[PDB]
């Protein structure tokens, strides 16, 4: 059981509560002795018991492991290679569309360097299309299928957590430490991501002019935000600096396109979590340790995972 106040934030309601200052009793190096300790926690790491009493999000479902502080999450490139007596064939046709006869081919030992970047809604740092913003799906005429689009040129996203958190170590057992967030230096400001409006507007124009091949010239076509579901899928959920971000994309996908300044970049607010699950799993949670200082990372958006309703 945790006793939690808000951090001293006095802004708009519920946003005051977006991070909590929780204190609790914890085991020491010695079996017979407890210690009273405190940590900051983000609102999404905790749930209320019923009063100011809280527990971690996972305790009624999963055991939890601290991710070791030394192992990096950086997506280092992997090449996949075939055993002797097998070969990889590479399609060379620039206007290949994911199925059927590729009329131009070469053979290799291994793939190019693939980065295991994990991100929902938008595809980050992955390979550009050879020419045109190519669109792929297994059956476009069915609305239930996802539709990948792959840009011929990157549109650049800058993400940040501008709070300067401190790391703190608590021993919880003989030779075992828990990394809490100690406090925050200076001003509190929201974690967010920016993308340039002209380049995003133009790039969305190019995706429409390719959907106009598969859907015809008469149709006005529209973009909308995701309708509902888990936080993992209703948001551009992704990793930056080793923090996990959950940006509200409703500023990107909000336009309707006719059958026919600018420096103001749009900005997406992002919530953050420390307690997480690999999205294809339940029953084993992970706690991501807190990162010192300000976080920034710069990345290329190079494709999208769209869906269609059924203009």
């Amino acid at each position, epitope marked *: 059981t945790l006793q939690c106040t808000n951090v001293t*934030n*006095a*802004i708009t309601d519920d946003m005051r509560g977006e991070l909590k200052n929780c204190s609790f009793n914890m085991t020491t190096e010695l079996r017979d002795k407890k210690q009273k300790v405190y940590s900051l926690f983000y609102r999404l790491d905790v749930v209320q018991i019923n009063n100011k009493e809280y527990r971690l999000i996972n305790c009624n479902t999963s055991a939890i492991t601290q991710a070791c502080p030394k192992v990096s999450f950086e997506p280092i490139p992997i090449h996949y290679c075939a055993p002797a007596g097998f070969a990889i064939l590479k399609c060379k046709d620039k206007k290949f569309n994911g199925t059927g006869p590729c009329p131009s081919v070469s053979t290799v030992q291994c793939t190019h360097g693939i980065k295991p970047v994990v991100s929902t809604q938008l595809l980050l740092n992955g390979s550009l299309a050879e020419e045109e913003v190519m669109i792929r799906s297994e059956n476009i005429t069915n609305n239930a299928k996802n539709i990948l689009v792959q840009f011929n040129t990157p549109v650049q996203i800058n993400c940040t957590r501008p709070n300067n958190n401190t790391r703190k170590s608590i021993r919880i057992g003989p030779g075992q430490a828990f990394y809490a967030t100690g406090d925050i230096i200076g*001003d*509190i*400001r929201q974690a967010h991501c920016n993308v340039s409006k002209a380049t995003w507007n133009e790039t969305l124009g190019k995706v429409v002019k390719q959907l106009r091949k598969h859907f015809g010239n008469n149709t006005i076509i529209r973009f909308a935000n995701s309708s509902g579901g888990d936080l993992e899928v209703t948001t551009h959920s992704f990793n930056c600096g080793g923090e996990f971000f959950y940006c509200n994309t409703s500023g990107l996908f909000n336009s309707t396109w006719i059958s026919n300044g600018s420096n103001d970049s749009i900005t997406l607010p992002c919530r953050i979590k420390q307690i997480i699950n690999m999205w294809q799993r339940i029953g084993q949670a992970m706690y991501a340790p807190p990162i010192q200082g300000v976080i920034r990372c710069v990345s290329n958006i190079t494709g999208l995972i769209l869906t269609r309703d059924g203009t």
Partner: antibody
């Protein structure tokens, strides 16, 4: 248009306490740092204390550290200086002023603008 | 602490004439974000200090364009291209880069007669 106004200045004997109020108008007061600055007819302008926007962080001049505490009530758009252990040297006019903005994604530079109307404070037996 | 001082202490000036006020610090006022948080205030008789100039050279809202400000490192100047009757008062340079914030001893303007 932005305005600040102050109340609660007056006379006291030494060793006593006074509380000043400054009230904010024409802006979202919880987006700004705030300062107290005093004028003595001799030495002129002297910085006294600063507070950040959520009130977690506070700073003081050496002449007042621990004798004074600054505090704020964002729900009331209002700032207080609680002065204790006053001396004849604390005789001054006290002005409040507005400092660093903290907009939702971004923090600005430091400022003293605008300044209040000012309150007279006098310390003698 | 960072000391501030202005070189002319009093300026008897004729209405319509230019006037200028040097200000100097004990240490460089360029801050770790790349700005220089010097500013100039004036105080007419019986009134609170009013800011005129900030970040060395930017003007406050509604300040008359006859005011100007310039400088670098430790050495700075106000200049007024012509004084008016509403320019009669006391002028202070000050700095916000380093705590405690600090002010010059200030310079008087008076009507030369």
């Amino acid at each position: 248009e932005v305005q600040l106004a102050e109340s609660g200045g007056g006379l006291t004997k030494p060793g006593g306490s006074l509380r000043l109020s400054c009230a904010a108008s024409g802006f979202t007061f919880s987006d700004f740092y705030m300062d107290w600055v005093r004028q003595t007819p001799g030495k002129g302008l002297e910085w006294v204390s600063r507070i950040n926007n959520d009130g977690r962080n506070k700073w003081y001049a050496d002449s007042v550290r621990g004798r004074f505490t600054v505090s704020r009530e964002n729900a009331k758009n209002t700032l207080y200086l609680q002065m204790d252990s006053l001396r004849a040297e604390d005789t001054a006019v006290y002005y409040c002023a507005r400092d660093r903005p903290v907009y939702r994604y971004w923090s600005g530079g430091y400022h003293l603008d605008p300044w209040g109307q000012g309150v007279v404070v006098t310390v003698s037996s | 602490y960072v000391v501030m001082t202005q070189s002319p202490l009093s300026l008897p000036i004729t209405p319509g004439q230019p006037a200028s006020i040097s200000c100097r610090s004990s240490q460089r006022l360029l801050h770790s974000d790349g700005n220089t948080y010097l500013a100039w205030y004036q105080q007419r008789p019986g009134q609170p200090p009013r800011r005129l100039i900030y970040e060395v050279s930017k003007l406050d809202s509604g300040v008359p364009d006859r005011f100007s400000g310039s400088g670098a490192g430790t050495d700075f100047t106000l200049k007024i291209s012509r004084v008016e009757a509403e320019d009669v008062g006391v002028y202070y340079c000050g700095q916000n880069t380093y705590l405690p914030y600090s002010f010059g001893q200030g310079s008087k303007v008076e009507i030369k007669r």
